[PDB]
Amino acid sequence: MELKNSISDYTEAEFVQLLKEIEKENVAATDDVLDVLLEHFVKITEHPDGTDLIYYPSDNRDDSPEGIVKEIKEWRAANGKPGFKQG
């Protein structure tokens, strides 16, 4: 879809759409497109663990698109960084 340049340009729903696009590319024959999407995910979330949020989720939260978005939102808020678009 459209890759926005910041988390603040994304509502939570739009960010979930990016996560499902990544799930689709996980099952593609190659990782060419997947890897550009992952670089984008890492760049805009800014979480030090990067792709680990998707592939190595903590046991203390759900391994789901909703769980990834929730962890991102809590980590960004805890670090005083702008969150998802509230509209």
Binding site: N26, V27, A28, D31, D35, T51, I54, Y55, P57
Partner: protein, 131 residues
């Protein structure tokens, strides 16, 4: 070489619920005996083909599939290696790799599962450069 057909052979080794925890150390993780049992005596068009089938089998073994996230299980189901943790990556190599202990360039079995192990990219590059 690795691009020629062949039959998989070998017994593999028993593994616990932390199969790949040491993929980034020494020679990495062994092929699981249960997985070896499923691939033994089957023929493959290439090592790349064996690799795909290897990961597919891992996704079908309940005891191993449970050790990976949902996104990683989907990758394995289509034959792609699971993504490693961010810290074990090396440039564009971001997925677990298979290493031949004894190189094909010296009677090393391309499809011998007892001569094959799973390693992280970072460890794999070190192994080949003498580290």
């Amino acid at each position: 070489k690795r691009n020629k057909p062949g039959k998989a052979t070998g017994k593999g080794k028993p593994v616990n619920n932390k199969w790949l925890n040491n993929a980034g150390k020494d020679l990495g993780s062994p092929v699981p005996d249960r997985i070896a049992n499923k691939l033994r005596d089957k023929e493959f068009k290439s090592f790349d083909d064996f690799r795909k089938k290897f990961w597919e089998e891992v996704s079908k073994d309940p005891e191993l599939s449970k050790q990976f996230s949902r996104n990683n299980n989907d990758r394995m189901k289509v034959g792609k290696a699971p993504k490693t943790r961010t810290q074990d990556v090396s440039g564009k190599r971001t997925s677990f790799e298979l290493h031949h202990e004894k190189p094909i360039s010296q009677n090393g079995g391309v499809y011998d599962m007892d001569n094959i192990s799973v390693v992280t990219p970072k460890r794999h590059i070190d192994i080949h450069r003498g580290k």
